[PDB]
Amino acid sequence: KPIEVTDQNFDETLGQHPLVLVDFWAEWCAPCRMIAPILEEIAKEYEGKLLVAKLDVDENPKTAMRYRVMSIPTVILFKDGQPVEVLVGAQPKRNYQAKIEKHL
Numbered sequence: 001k002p003i004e005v006t007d008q009n010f011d012e013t014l015g016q017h018p019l020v021l022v023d024f025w026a027e028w029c030a031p032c033r034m035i036a037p038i039l040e041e042i043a044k045e046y047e048g049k050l051l052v053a054k055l056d057v058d059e060n061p062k063t064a065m066r067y068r069v070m071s072i073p074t075v076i077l078f079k080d081g082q083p084v085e086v087l088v089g090a091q092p093k094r095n096y097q098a099k100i101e102k103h104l
Contacts, residue, residue: 001043002041007063012056014081017051021096022076024055024069031090032073037097038093039075046100056069 005013014020025032025041043052057064077085077099085099
């Protein structure tokens with residue numbers, strides 16, 4: 001299931017896993033709350049080929065600034081440490097699946 005990433009371990013995490021789905025979120029964000037359980041389902045469906053990670057923008061402002069994520073929820077998929085897909089806003093599971101399988 002989804003793990004927590006910080007400004008400190010963000011890079012290490014991306015370099016240790018081939019495909020990582022990172023959720024930029026915040027506690028006060030309703031749309032974010034809506035996709036959390038959806039991302040958990042995503043985590044299990046792709047367990048083994050994908051790692052789901054969560055980045056709280058309030059505790060990690062430099063990381064949000066880094067990717068200029070100024071509207072949440074924003075999900076970024078990284079392949080071999082490099083960003084390859086972005087999903088802005090709360091979306092149905094199928095939209096995430098499409099972009100995930102697009103990279104196996």
